[PDB]
Each structure stands twice: as structure tokens, then as C-alpha cells.
Amino acid sequence: KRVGKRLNIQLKKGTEGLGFSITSRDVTIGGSAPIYVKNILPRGAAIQDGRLKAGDRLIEVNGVDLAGKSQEEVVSLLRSTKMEGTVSLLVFRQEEA
């Protein structure tokens, strides 16, 4: 099984997105593929907030289930978010032991 733990991180939108890029497992064309922060950019609310780092998988965003949406769908929901809007992104951290 996969070890690790889930975490909840809410970031306050600040125009310059959140400073986090997400990758797609690419399980299927359009069915259900797990998305996880490919890397935390040095310009956003995430890095400034210091709560959500890289190597995490988005389990839910703003109370939404990203278990079937898509990469563009996921990125779309975050991209839709505007300034003055705390986006609660539930991530999943995994250890290497």
C-alpha cells in the first residue's frame, strides 16, 4: 500500500495564482487520473503561506472531488479562482520510507 497522510491547506488568492504547479498521472484519456503538485513555484500564496509543499497530491479543492475531473479541469477550477478568495486545497503527503 501507499504510506503517507492527508493535509488541509487553504491559500488566500493574491492575483499571482497560488505558486504551485500540478502534474497529471495520465491514467486515462478522460476518466479518472490522480493530480499532484509537480512543483511549488517561488511566486504564489502557497510558498508564501508555507503550508503546502511539493510531492503532494490534491485530494480535494474548495470542497470539490478531483477524483475524476481532469488536469485542465483541476487547473481550471483553481485558475477560475480570483484575488480575495481563500482556496482550501486538501493535499496528500507521502513519505519515502
Curated annotation (Swiss-Prot):
<comment type="function">
    <text>Adapter protein involved in asymmetrical cell division and cell polarization processes. Seems to play a central role in the formation of epithelial tight junctions. Association with PARD6B may prevent the interaction of PARD3 with F11R/JAM1, thereby preventing tight junction assembly. The PARD6-PARD3 complex links GTP-bound Rho small GTPases to atypical protein kinase C proteins. Required for establishment of neuronal polarity and normal axon formation in cultured hippocampal neurons. Involved in Schwann cell peripheral myelination. Targets the phosphatase PTEN to cell junctions.</text>
</comment>
<comment type="subunit">
    <text>Component of a complex whose core is composed of ARHGAP17, AMOT, PALS1, PATJ and PARD3/PAR3. Interacts (via PDZ 1 domain) with PARD6A, PARD6B and F11R/JAM1. Interacts with AURKA, AURKB and SIRT2. Interacts with PRKCI. Interacts with PRKCZ. Part of a complex with PARD6A or PARD6B, PRKCI or PRKCZ and CDC42 or RAC1. Interacts with LIMK2 and CDH5. Component of the Par polarity complex, composed of at least phosphorylated PRKCZ, PARD3 and TIAM1. Directly interacts with TIAM1 and TIAM2. Interacts with ECT2 and FBF1. Interacts (via PDZ 3 domain) with PTEN (via C-terminus).</text>
</comment>
<comment type="similarity">
    <text>Belongs to the PAR3 family.</text>
</comment>
<feature type="domain" description="PDZ 2">
    <location>
        <begin position="8"/>
        <end position="93"/>
    </location>
</feature>
<feature type="modified residue" description="Phosphotyrosine">
    <location>
        <position position="36"/>
    </location>
</feature>
<protein>
    <recommendedName>
        <fullName>Partitioning defective 3 homolog</fullName>
    </recommendedName>
</protein>
